[PDB]
Design a protein around this ligand. Structure first.
Ligand SMILES: CC(=O)N[C@H]1[C@H](O[C@H]2[C@@H](O)[C@@H](NC(C)=O)[C@H](O[C@H]3[C@H](O)[C@H]4N=C(N(C)C)O[C@H]4[C@@H]3CO)O[C@@H]2CO)O[C@H](CO)[C@@H](O)[C@H]1O
Ligand SMILES: CC(=O)N[C@H]1[C@H](O[C@H]2[C@@H](O)[C@@H](NC(C)=O)[C@H](O[C@H]3[C@H](O)[C@H]4N=C(N(C)C)O[C@H]4[C@@H]3CO)O[C@@H]2CO)O[C@H](CO)[C@@H](O)[C@H]1O
Lengths: 497, 496
């Protein structure tokens, strides 16, 4: 099966209202940058972002010029003429609109509350999709928590029912309308809805994991924002999944959730695969087309895992633009983030940046010894390891944020398409390295094990292993006269073949 | 409120059938040993043991000569003439009858299975109570498994209903009929029903904790069977409670159940106090009137914490009675147990035993250097700290197993009564020591705290404290944007 290549395409309202394809100071990355050849490299383009309004319906930001909106969307859907497999989805949400303290947060929470609100919201999603010519719906609420998850799931199931009927109604069986969501790529946010992952994923074609932003100025130690595997020398974190309402024992939680652990791409993927009912084919690994920068880093380790003096507030509080060579940063007024396109230019501008590589995390980083800067980002080389990981783990594909941050020639997208589809690219001998792998084992991903059947009336010693009722069990202490599963003395450690 | 002093009184069937108050070799401790002065020192005498028969009703052992039984029981209830607050309860169960592999085990499991079996069993408890003249019911099932707990609870609720009805019917408002159970005094067995403690305790006047047998031949290292507090030099144990079906988070479980931990009396009491709805006034601390003996011990620490060669099998697998001076051990064919009465007699027979004291656990023990023997037991001195502990923790009182093992002078019972009631006994200066205390914190014992009220819309860093819905919470990590109870980043750490 072809690996999905899902590229989000972010275009702010101000840009939609002044859309032009001949002035990069107004629209840095117009749709015209995507040629028929680049259109062929993508399976999905997710237009970002639509929102949920106070009427609790899917809608464009009110400030959007509707005619300019349709026009930008038409330029994207026209790309389908060059790729019969391409879908132009729209994404609802994003950090600014839907974070807990976001401008439209209450609308997300309220829309999923009842059967009536869910039906009215779902219907608006299908109406917007058909009105503008989209091919599916992507939900990017960052993020529903505990009490809101059941509504969220029911909202997804209702959208799924409406889209499936729409597919039949429009005779779109060859290219069915799709539903996806962008999910947390780190344990802290993932802990909010983790216990119900199987239900959340059931109605989706894919869950796009935001496996990046695992590092940033809001953290005290500099680190790679999307390390594939862990580096023992890098910082580790409390595993928040241990606090999810799973109703598992202390032994089960401890075994399933190693802690502290390395916040990596592999960790997020394995955490999703751990849960029974979450198919690998639906998991899509996100990669960033931008980097995050830190200033004030100590030397010696290329700036990795160092204390720093980077403001962590949003918006950027200063007028001081300290990321050398980043003119995009001055225009956008934030020296802490830069598109790959700009970072590649900085590497070309002979500014004193050393492009370094961590062979454990399999990711590049920039170090500016002279000024004490550190930049974590991804490139065509780190993408080789992530693409092989994707094939090896049988994931559904790759997703990236966002199309508009690739360089002018679209090399990052081209690289991804190449790793999955080029006849002349061969990664059979690519060495995945010795970086740290995440190996939590829970009640949902138990290995096959072999042990003598349990014998009623027998007394067992601590550590004894018996098979009973489909599982292999182990005693946590001595003199067990209870049957496996009838009391807290036995730990479920394996499955019977 | 006077502290309860609950003395279990065990009289095996052969002794009832051959009851005599004139022949110590037949009935070592007949009722006549309980003089009026001793009767005034007890609040309850729990006659042991009755059982549950195949008809799934409470009943005396079949081999019991009923007339002799009523005679023994009548002497007990006659004692009430000397103490108007005294209750003569009967206990159903015991290790032999009710343990998982015990002879009547199935009857316990089946009696609590259905509403009909539960009504029939409950009704039989009250009938036996009124028929033989008892003042209450004590259930000592060791122990209901997790799956059998809901039936156990309904059974207790049903007996409670019928006993309160009988109390009104019999005009016993002054001395209401009571219902109690003897509960596990260690985390391994306690973990079977720990999650439903509150429901198990609601229908009871008291839960009598068997906070003893925490050490014995079945363990690889000799240890005190009833240490009040822990000794860092002794063995430690896996805290089975962290595996109970509580539905709590890793943080909550870890803070409530440190592991490994010291298996002590204080640990069992605190473990009970950690659950919401288990009032201290209902918790009764059990103490043993007997010692446990080990052989083949090594020197160095008076026999403590040593490897040993004591058989762990029941019945004792041998006719080798190695407990020097223990004549009673030969009579009962087990040199691994001895009553306080016999231990005392072993001490005055100068057989080479040394009475030592551990000031961490606050308990005595014997050490026989020549034969490499170790004996863990309790006495009037260890009872001073446990009685003070009972007063400090506001527990319901003390319970002991069993009256028939006290000495002829009734020194152990006298000591318990003295510590709670004597006008001339002053323990205000008694030093509880530096032995290890159980540090677990749970729902039932959150410490009083104060903190800024949670503010809707505020982001909190890691470790921030706030008050919300009556409790004080703390964040487990940073950048918290939602409310306590609505975001698992918050840990309920205190209260009002
Ligand atoms: C409408 C608006 O808020 N406009 C802002 C704009 O906000 C952006 C940026 O902060 C994006 N950051 C970067 C590094 O591109 C941010 O990207 C988020 C996105 O919200 C999340 N959703 C996904 N998906 C895969 C669905 O990935 C994450 C990414 C990456 O973290 O999105 C917000 C809007 O929600 O920022 C620009 C520049 O600062 C500003 O001028 C203004 O246009
Ligand atoms: C019917 C029977 O098995 N009779 C045995 C008798 O068994 C006794 C003894 O083993 C008791 N042990 C000691 C040290 O006294 C044992 O006491 C148990 C009791 O079952 C549990 N219940 C409580 N409560 C407070 C309710 O405490 C524990 C105690 C202490 O572990 O009980 C069994 C019967 O269940 O043993 C004697 C020889 O000692 C033998 O002759 C015979 O009569």
């Amino acid at each position: 099966t072809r690996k999905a290549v899902i590229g989000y395409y972010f275009i702010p309202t101000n840009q939609i209202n002044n859309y032009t394809e001949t002035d990069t100071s107004v629209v840095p990355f117009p749709v015209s940058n995507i040629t028929p050849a680049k259109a062929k490299q993508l399976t999905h383009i997710n237009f970002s972002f639509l929102d949920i309004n106070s009427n609790l319906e899917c809608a464009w930001d009110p400030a959007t010029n509707d005619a300019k909106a349709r026009d930008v969307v038409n330029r994207l859907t026209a790309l389908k003429a060059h790729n019969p497999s391409l879908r132009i989805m729209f994404s609802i949400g994003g950090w600014y609109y839907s974070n807990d303290l976001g401008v439209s947060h209450a609308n997300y929470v309220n829309a999923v509350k009842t059967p009536a609100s869910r039906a009215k919201f779902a219907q608006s999603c299908v109406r917007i999709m058909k009105d503008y010519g989209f091919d599916g719906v992507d939900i990017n609420w960052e993020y529903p928590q505990a009490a809101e998850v059941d509504g969220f799931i029911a909202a997804l199931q209702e959208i799924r029912t409406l889209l499936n009927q729409q597919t039949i109604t429009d005779g779109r069986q060859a290219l069915p309308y799709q539903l996806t969501i962008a999910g947390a790529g780190g344990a802290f946010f993932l802990s909010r809805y983790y216990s119900k992952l199987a239900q959340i994923v059931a109605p989706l074609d894919y869950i796009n994991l935001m496996t990046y932003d695992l590092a940033g100025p809001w953290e005290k130690v500099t680190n790679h924002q999307a390390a594939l595997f862990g580096d023992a020398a890098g910082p580790t974190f409390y595993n928040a999944l241990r606090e999810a309402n799973l109703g598992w024992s202390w032994e089960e939680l401890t075994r399933a959730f190693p802690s502290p652990f390395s916040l990596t791409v592999d960790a997020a993927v394995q955490q999703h695969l751990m849960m029974e009912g979450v198919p690998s084919a639906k998991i899509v690994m996100g990669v960033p087309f931008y980097g995050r920068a830190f200033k004030g880093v100590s030397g010696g380790n290329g700036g990795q895992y160092s204390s720093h003096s980077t403001p962590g507030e949003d918006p950027y509080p200063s007028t001081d633009y300290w990321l050398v060579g980043c003119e995009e940063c001055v225009r956008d007024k934030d020296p802490r983030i830069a598109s790959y396109r700009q970072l590649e230019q900085m590497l070309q501008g002979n500014y004193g940046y050393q492009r370094l590589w961590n062979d454990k995390t399999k990711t590049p980083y920039l170090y500016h010894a002279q000024n004490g800067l550190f930049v974590t980002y991804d490139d065509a080389e780190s993408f080789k390891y992530k693409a092989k990981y994707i094939k090896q783990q049988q994931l559904g594909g790759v997703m990236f944020w966002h199309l508009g941050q690739d360089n002018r020639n679209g090399d990052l997208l081209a690289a991804l398409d190449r790793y999955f589809n080029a006849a002349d690219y061969d990664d059979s001998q690519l060495d995945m390295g010795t970086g740290l792998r995440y190996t939590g084992v829970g009640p949902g991903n138990l290995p096959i094990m072999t042990a003598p059947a349990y014998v009623p009336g027998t007394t067992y010693a601590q550590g004894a292993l018996v098979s009973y009722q489909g599982y292999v069990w182990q005693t946590k202490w001595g003199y067990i006269t209870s049957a496996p599963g009838s009391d807290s003395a036995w730990l479920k450690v394996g499955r019977v073949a």
